[PDB]
Structures are given as C-alpha cells and as structure tokens.
C-alpha cells in the first residue's frame, strides 16, 4: 500500500513512517549520521537530505506519504548532503587513523567514505571546551563532538536518565550534563547509552581511549602534532581514508569482539565485549540484541574489571589448618571426591546438599542438579531463587502454571499500564526501567509504582503510592475486589481462560477499600483511582520484585498479583502480563534446570513417576524420591545435625542469607564445606576447599534472562590462570565421583538438557548462534513462545485458576524494633559487590554502604549526614554510615546490600521465611538507631549520580538549534 516512486522506480511502502526506513530497506546510499534505529529521528545532522515531492527535506523525519517522488542521485540532494557533512566535519577533527572509534563502525567515517568526499568547505574549528575526563568510565570530547544529539536522545528518551542536554543557545553548542555540571559531579547514571549511541569518538569509553588501535596509544603531546601534520599534508580525504581503513583492519586483528550476556541482573542484556588480549576495552551493544538492543547500564557496560581483577582466584584453594593453601587441581579434586564419597557412604546421600549459582549458565545449574541426583543421589539443591524467585514462581504455579515473565521487554514497552510493586527497577533491572520510562515519556504509558521507598522510577511514575511493609496483599486484593465487583473486570476472559471466579470472590469477601486504606496507611482516593486506571487500561504489565515477594506472605501476594491480572484479563494479550523480575542473569535459567529441590529440569515436579523414569533412563542412576530441603531451612537442619556437607558454587550464601550469624554458626558447625567462587567471597572464607570459579566472560553457556530468553554466550577470554569454567569443574568432580560425563563443550550439556526439559525442547546451540535467542517454552521444531499463555494455559484444562489468599501478617519484631530498615541494592553496585567493587569507577561513584534516612526521622532522632550509626536486631548488629535523602519516608529506612563487612544489612534480618517456599523475609527488618559519631565523611560523594539534578526534556530539542541565526538548513542553502 501507499505506492511510492524512489530513484525514478516504482516501489511499495511498509509500516515504516519515515522515508529513511524505506531507503534503508531499499539499500539506497543516503547519508544517515544522526539516525539510529533505536533512537529514532533526531534530525540534527541534516545529512539525510532527499528530494521529497521535489522539495529538499530530511529523510530521517520525512513522513512516507502516498505518491511522493524520491530522488537521491540528483546534484541538488548530493550538494545538500555534502554541505551538511561539511558542517558536521566543521565540528569533527576526523583523525581516523589515530582515532580509537575507527574500528570500522564509526558513522562519520563510514558515511564520509560512502559519500566519497575529499574536502570540507568549512575547516575544522576546535570548540573552546576541553575534554571532560571527570567520569571514570567514558569521556566526552567537545572538540570531536558533532552535535548530532544521539547521545542526548539516548540519555533523554531511550534511557530516560535525562542527564544530557544540549546548550543550543551557547555560541558553540555542546553536550552538557545537568546544568553543564562536570560529568562525574552530574546525575549521570553511567548507563553507557551515550557512549554506545555516539556516531563519532566524542562520547567514548575511557577503556578504548589510547588502547584500541596501534597508532592511537601515542601520547597526545606527540599525537596532536602528527594530526596537524596529516591535516596539512593530505589534499584529498580518499587516500587517508583508505589508510584509516587499513588501520581499522589493523585493529581487527588485536580487537576481539565476542557476544556475551551480562551477568549482573536478570534483564540479560547481550552485547559484544571488545577486548585487546585480557583487558576489556569496550562493551558495545548491538541493535540486534534481543533483550536490550543498545540499552545498557553501568554494570554491564563498565563493570567488567572484576574479570581481570588480581583478587580473582586463579588456583584451587584447600583449607590447610588455619589458612588457605594454593593446591593443585588434581589433589583438590581427589580431596573433594574422597570427602563426598565418605559422607555419602557413611550417612547417606540425603545428608548432602549442594547449591548452584543463579549467576552461572544453564549448563552449570544442570550439572549441579545432575551431580546431586544422577551422581550423588540427593535432591538438596537450591540457588538464590529461594531468596529471590521461589515465591513468585510458586504463585505462577498456583495461578498460571508457568514460571517466568509472560513476555519480552518489548511487550513491557507495548503495555498501556505497568503495575510495578516492590520493584526498584531503576536500580535493580536498569534496562527494563529504561524501556518503561521510554514508553512513559514518549508512548504515553502510565505506570503505577507501589513501594515503600521513592527511587528514580517512583518520582517518575504516573501514580506512586507507598504502602506499609508487606501490605501489598491488602490493597492489591481490595483493588481486585473493586475491579471484579464494579464490572470493569474482563468477564469474558474469566469465563474463557480462568477458573474459580466465585470462589475467589468469596475469598475477597473480608476485603474492602476502607480495610486496605487502614492496613496500608494509604488514602482511599489513590486506591480507587489506581483501580479505575487498572480497569480502564487495555494492557496491564505487572512487575513484582523482592519488595513484595521477599516477605512472610510473599508467595500469597505473588498469587494475589497474578490473579489480579487474571481478573483484569491481561494474560495472552500481546504486550501485557506478569513479569516477575528475575534477579540474577540466570536465576530464571537455574530455576528452569531443576535448581529448586522440589522440581526437576523442565520445570517438572520431582514427585512424578514419568519424569523420574525418563531421567533414570537418560542418566542411568535412580532419582531421589524424597524432595530436597529448601535453602533457608538448610541452616536449621545443620543446627539439628541433619546436614553435614555443602557444595555451594558462585553463591555467597554465608553473607546474603537471612541472619548471617546463623549461617556463620552453621558454617562453623558443619564438617566439610566446598565453595566455588571467582573471588574469595565471605562464604569462600569458611570452606574446607575453595574451587576457583570462572566468570561468564571466560566461559561459554546459555543465560536465561527475566523474559524467559535463553541467549547463548561466547568465550570472551581464556580463563584466568588455570582456573576452569564451572561446568568443567563440575564435570571433573562428578568424574572423580564415578559419573562418567563426557562434555567437550557445553553444547552437549545444552542439547541433553533440551531433550530432557519439555520447556527447553527446542533450544540448541546452532539455533542460538550470534544474537539469536529463544524464549522458553520452546517446542522440538524450534519455534519459541515470545508471549506466554498466548492461546492456552499449561494446566490440563487449559484454563488458569484463581488462588484464594489473604494478608499474611508480616513478622515485624514489634516493640523496641521501631525503625523498620529496608534492604535492597544500588544501581552501580551488585549485592555485596564481589564484582563491582573490583572496578575502580563504580567504587569512585559509590565507595561504601550508606543508610538512607528520611528527613522527618532526622528531626525526632536528631541524625545527620556522614554519621556512623548502629542498627541492632535479635540476629545482628551493624555499624553503617548515614545519608540524608527524601527517598525513604518516616521510620522506614533503606540499607543497600553494597557492603560485605560488618555493615552488611543481612545481620539484622531473621530466620523467618515464607510458608509456601521458605523464602527469608529480608524486607521485614527492624532495629534501633544509635548515634556514634556526630561529624564524619559523607558516604555518598558529590560525584555520585544521586547528587545530580537531571534536566527532563523530550528529544534533543533541535528546534532550539533551528532557531539559531548561524544555523542554515542545507536544503534551502543549496536552493
């Protein structure tokens, strides 16, 4: 439809709105410098001038109206594009041969080569501004800035950090952070969008700077004169452009660009990691990345210094006396195998419990569970999901039947309303929050953030309401009652794909709007208006992170949320559904491959005859009928003497579990302990033998992110020292246990698990090549399911069931535990920071843990900033610094987990867990407030991103540039 003619030849139009998309699909060589597919039309480079309807206009923003005439080889359009690129090069020095970004992907270089230009009519003029190297990760070079606005559009529209603007009013326009604050002192999240989206080397990572190529490591005092020499020597750009292409080929040999998936959080963003030997030069996202595309956070794009950190354990460590001796691989393997055989043939395999890391690949968790069941014969396996996703998955089983998100992050963006409850998506799953904020700022989607704290998203939400600690169930079920009672609920969906509507309504009888108003401490008007919005919203996406699921009734309120969507009728609809925020990069993958003790790989319960018979046939070893014990209850079993040995890999559970005094006592109580961590973590300190893990960069596997996407990794580095990828270590351990495993590369493990797992039936390494990713469930034909519950639910009847649940009383200690401290995670730091702390930049941004305290409570208790304070709970006693901010309200305070010493929050939390899944109630914590030091150094430096003031504007605001008298449009300049 919408017939068009381009280049004098008839062509058809597609859903694309602008001429530039059609030209790209038609492979017309139209210069497009300022256009990025994810960014959208920025219209600031004017090199995309084409003749639409005869008039010269920007093809990047020219609407593809029916019947228009398109010409691109005309002398007029060629002259306009040449003038535009000359204006661009007036702002770009263009020293391609000695420029780090000339890895062949630089749009100025490519476009300049494509136009076959040889001269710039306007000579290059250095801007008066100096390079801004304040940031420890990426620098900005206003001399090389071409003012294309891609970085500003990224920071304002696709990442919505809003730290970047452009001072068009200035005599020399440039990119400015906040109000021209230096970069470090500004509100820059350090997400890396500006660096990734920059066409030129204007906004480029300091890792590349002076390290990308061969001639770019030359000192600036002796590189700049060479640049001036070449400027004054070459007459045509063609020859030196060819020389720069040779230098790009130069870089190609030394620069290794391998795809990987970020290990930190469950968004599972995939990107190439441009390295030079062992150091990491750049983290370059690609538009083809499924989970993020170009989107990235500070962790995944500047947090990989832990791989090359000297603290990394290169050799196996054995607990010799009172020290850790650096022992050989073979002797450590023999020791662990002999000890495991001893405690297996003495007290039985049931007294053996092993933990896989949710940070490791699917092959890793599958190998853990196989070693437990197909080798040891026990079922005691778990991961962080016991603390993270056990109640969410339990609720999904109880209502929908499938664990994981209902769809992809693209479906999150496509939603009309996002119901985020207990989620610090801005600081925990950053890229998903960028998608949500992009849809809110641009697509007009309204979101309802419901959490006690006021994070970045809460202050940027359509309706932010803070309920009481764990009181999400009350107001949520009241909202569901109102929706189902006033007729706004989708009754057709209820009759079609839902069961037990009247039973759920009977369960909702005691729940009233005033009841929720009293319980949650929230006014009735906000609840009624958000319920009206939910009823009116066509598509609803409900995200619930640990703020709600990590509670005594966390499973109950997870079922409540899921059946709330069920009543609303969002499952199966494109762009709407339940998206429990999977925390670790592969916590979803670990749970998929039988990490939880009650289920096998394929998300099948262990107490099923058919699956047990199939796993016996494939493995050759009988399956333990007795379900394994939960991770949290393991410590109590140890204190009762039931458990004696642990094999926990890549999980520092001695510091992240509730009441870490209790896990410390259990650790000192148990006999044999083997841990598998890249760094000498807190758990690694208490271990009879330490096995040197390998980070996901140095190992190949498959990461299953929150969107139930299984994306294959690549071996970025050979493992440091002689340490091995965790799958290799597990294979060696099992072989020393008489397993007989033969897996040369993890593809065999992946295909074996695919055969075993009904949900993973179709995932294979040849189907996961490059950036291709499959979202479980996948059938044997290889066709995945991007949206869950699209046609039918997994239940035998094909229709989901509403689960009757009530408000489970939070285990608040009561009495002297007045102040209710809240525990979470910061954006820059990852849990205790076994990885981020090893990166110098993140340490500079956030050096130490802090206790965020409310201004109201700063008056009655008389507390100030930079003060060391004491928090005491029947399970711990921490000494943490203090921070003054309005993010927290009243007594409730925020204590991020970004310290691993005496200041870790996990001392205060107790051994009270959920009824359904025994998930510790980390969010249910209370303590004292003791003032130790009145005057001290503020834990949050001025260079932290929370101290800045972002400028919220939509787009690059080009209209300000167009209002400048000096600016002239090339289309009417050629005239």
């Amino acid at each position: 439809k919408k017939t068009i003619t381009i280049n004098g030849v008839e062509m058809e139009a597609s859903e694309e709105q602008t001429v530039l998309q059609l030209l790209n699909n038609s492979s017309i060589e139209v210069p497009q410098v300022c256009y990025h597919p994810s960014l959208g039309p920025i219209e600031t480079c004017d090199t995309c001038i084409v003749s639409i309807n005869g008039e010269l206009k920007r093809s990047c923003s020219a609407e593809l109206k029916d019947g228009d005439v398109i010409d691109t080889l005309s002398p007029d359009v060629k002259k306009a594009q040449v003038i535009g690129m000359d204006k661009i090069l007036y702002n770009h020095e263009l020293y391609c041969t000695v420029c780090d970004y000339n890895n062949g992907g630089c749009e100025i270089h490519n476009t300049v080569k494509e136009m076959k230009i040889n001269h710039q009519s306007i000579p290059f003029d250095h801007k008066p501004y100096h390079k801004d190297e304040s940031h420890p990760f990426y620098r900005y070079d206003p001399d090389q800035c071409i003012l294309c606005g891609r970085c500003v559009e990224a920071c304002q529209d696709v990442q919505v950090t809003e730290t970047l603007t452009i001072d068009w009013e200035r005599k020399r326009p440039r990119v400015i952070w906040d109000n021209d604050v230096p970069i470090n002192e500004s509100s820059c999240v350090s997400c890396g969008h500006c660096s990734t989206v920059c066409p030129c080397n204007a906004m480029m990572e300091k890792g590349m700077e002076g390290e990308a190529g061969y001639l770019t490591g030359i000192n600036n005092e002796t590189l700049r004169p060479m640049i001036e020499i070449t400027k004054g020597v070459e007459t045509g750009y063609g020859s030196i452009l060819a020389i720069s292409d040779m230098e790009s080929a130069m870089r190609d040999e030394r620069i290794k660009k391998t795809k990987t998936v970020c290990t930190y959080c469950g968004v599972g963003c995939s990107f190439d990691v441009w390295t030079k030997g062992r150091d990491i030069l750049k983290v370059e996202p690609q538009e083809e990345a499924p989970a993020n595309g170009i989107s990235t956070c500070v962790k995944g794009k500047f947090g990989w210094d832990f791989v090359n950190s000297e603290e990394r354990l290169t050799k196996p460590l054995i607990r010799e006396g009172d020290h850790f001796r650096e022992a050989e691989w073979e002797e450590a393997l023999l020791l662990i195998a002999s000890k495991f055989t001893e405690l297996k043939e003495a007290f039985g395999p049931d007294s053996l419990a092993f933990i896989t890391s949710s940070k490791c690949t699917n092959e890793e968790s599958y190998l853990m569970q196989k070693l437990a069941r197909g080798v040891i014969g026990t079922n005691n396996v778990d991961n962080c999901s016991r603390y993270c996703q056990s109640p969410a998955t339990a609720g999904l089983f109880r209502t929908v039947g499938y664990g994981g998100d209902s769809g992809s992050i693209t479906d999150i963006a496509q939603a009309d309303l996002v119901l985020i409850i207990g989620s610090n998506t801005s600081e925990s799953h950053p890229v998903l929050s960028t998608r949500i904020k992009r849809a809110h700022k641009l697509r007009g989607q309204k979101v309802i953030v419901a959490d006690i704290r006021k994070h970045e998203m809460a202050e940027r939400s359509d309706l932010f309401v803070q309920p009481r600690a764990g009181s999400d169930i009350v107001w949520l079920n009241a909202i569901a009652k109102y929706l189902i009672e006033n007729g706004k609920a989708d009754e057709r969906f209820l009759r079609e794909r839902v069961n037990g509507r009247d039973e759920y309504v009977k369960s909702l009888a005691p729940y009233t709007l005033e009841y929720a108003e009293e319980k949650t401490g929230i006014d009735q008007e906000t609840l009624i208006q958000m319920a009206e919005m939910i009823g009116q919203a066509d598509s609803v996406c409900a995200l619930w992170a640990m703020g709600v699921t990590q509670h005594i009734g966390g499973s109950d309120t997870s079922t409540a949320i899921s059946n709330l969507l069920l009543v609303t009728g969002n499952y199966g609809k494109p762009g709407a559904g339940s998206y429990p925020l999977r925390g670790h990069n592969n916590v979803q993958g670990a749970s998929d491959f039988g990490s939880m003790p009650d289920r096998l790989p394929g998300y099948e319960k262990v107490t099923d005859e058919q699956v047990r018979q199939k796993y016996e046939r494939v493995w050759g070893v009988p399956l333990p009928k007795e379900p394994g014990m939960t991770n949290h209850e393991m410590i109590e079993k140890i204190h009762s003497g039931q458990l004696k040995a642990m094999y926990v890999k890549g999980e520092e559970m001695g510091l992240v579990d509730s009441n870490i005094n209790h896990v410390h006592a259990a650790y000192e109580k148990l006999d044999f302990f083997v841990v598998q961590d890249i760094f000498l973590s807190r758990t690694a300190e208490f271990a009879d033998v330490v096995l040197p893990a390998s980070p996901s960069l140095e190992k190949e596997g498959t990461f299953t992110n929150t969107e139930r996407r299984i994306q294959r990794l690549y071996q970025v580095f050979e493992p440091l020292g002689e340490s091995k990828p965790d799958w290799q270590i597990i294979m060696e351990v099992a072989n020393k246990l008489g397993a007989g495993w033969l897996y040369e590369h993890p593809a065999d493990i992946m295909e074996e698990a695919a055969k075993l797992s009904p949900i993973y039936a179709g995932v294979t390494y040849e189907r996961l090549e490059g950036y291709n990713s499959l979202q479980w469930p996948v059938n044997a034909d290889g066709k995945d399911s991007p949206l869950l519950f699209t046609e039918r639910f997994p239940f035998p009847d094909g229709k989901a069931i509403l689960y009757p649940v009530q408000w489970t009383e939070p285990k608040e200690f009561g009495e002297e535990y007045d102040i209710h401290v809240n525990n979470g995670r910061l954006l820059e730091h990852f849990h205790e920071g076994n990885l981020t702390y090893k990166s110098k930049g993140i340490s500079e941004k956030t050096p130490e843990v802090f206790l965020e305290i409310s201004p109201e409570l700063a008056a009655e208790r008389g507390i100030q900033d930079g003060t060391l304070v004491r928090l005491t709970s029947p399970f711990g006693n921490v000494k943490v610094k203090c921070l003054i901010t309005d993010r927290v309200k009243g007594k409730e305070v925020y204590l991020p987990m970004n310290d691993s010493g005496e200041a870790a929050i996990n001392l205060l939390t107790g051994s009270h867990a959920d009824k359904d899944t025994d998930t510790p109630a980390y969010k249910e914590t209370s303590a004292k407030m003791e003032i130790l030091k009145h005057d001290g150094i503020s834990p949050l430096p001025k260079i932290n991103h929370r101290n800045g003031n972002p400028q919220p504007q939509i787009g690059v605001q080009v209209h300000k540039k167009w209002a400048r008298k000096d600016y002239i449009f090339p289309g009417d300049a050629v005239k």
Partner: protein, 57 residues
Amino acid sequence: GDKVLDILVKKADTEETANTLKNLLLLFGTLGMLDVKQLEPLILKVNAGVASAVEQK
C-alpha cells in the same frame, strides 16, 4: 621510540614541512595527470635540440 616520534612530529609540525609534503603529493598527482605518451616525441625533439645547441662549439 616515543621520544623519537615526539621529536619527529615537533620538528615536522611547522607549516613549511607540511606544505612541502602536501606539495610533493600534489606534484606526484599532477605528473600523473600529465599525459606522457605524447611527450616521448617531445623528449626526442628536446634531445636533438640540445645536441644541436651544444654542437655550436
């Protein structure tokens, strides 16, 4: 080597040297533009003329 390169660039960065190299490249380009197939008879005639000129004692 860094010091050697520094000395080389700091001595060369003068506009005279950059102009010299640019004009050498331009001279090569122009000599390429000049067609020499027709210039061989001209060279032979110049040879004969120089021989005649030096022939005059």
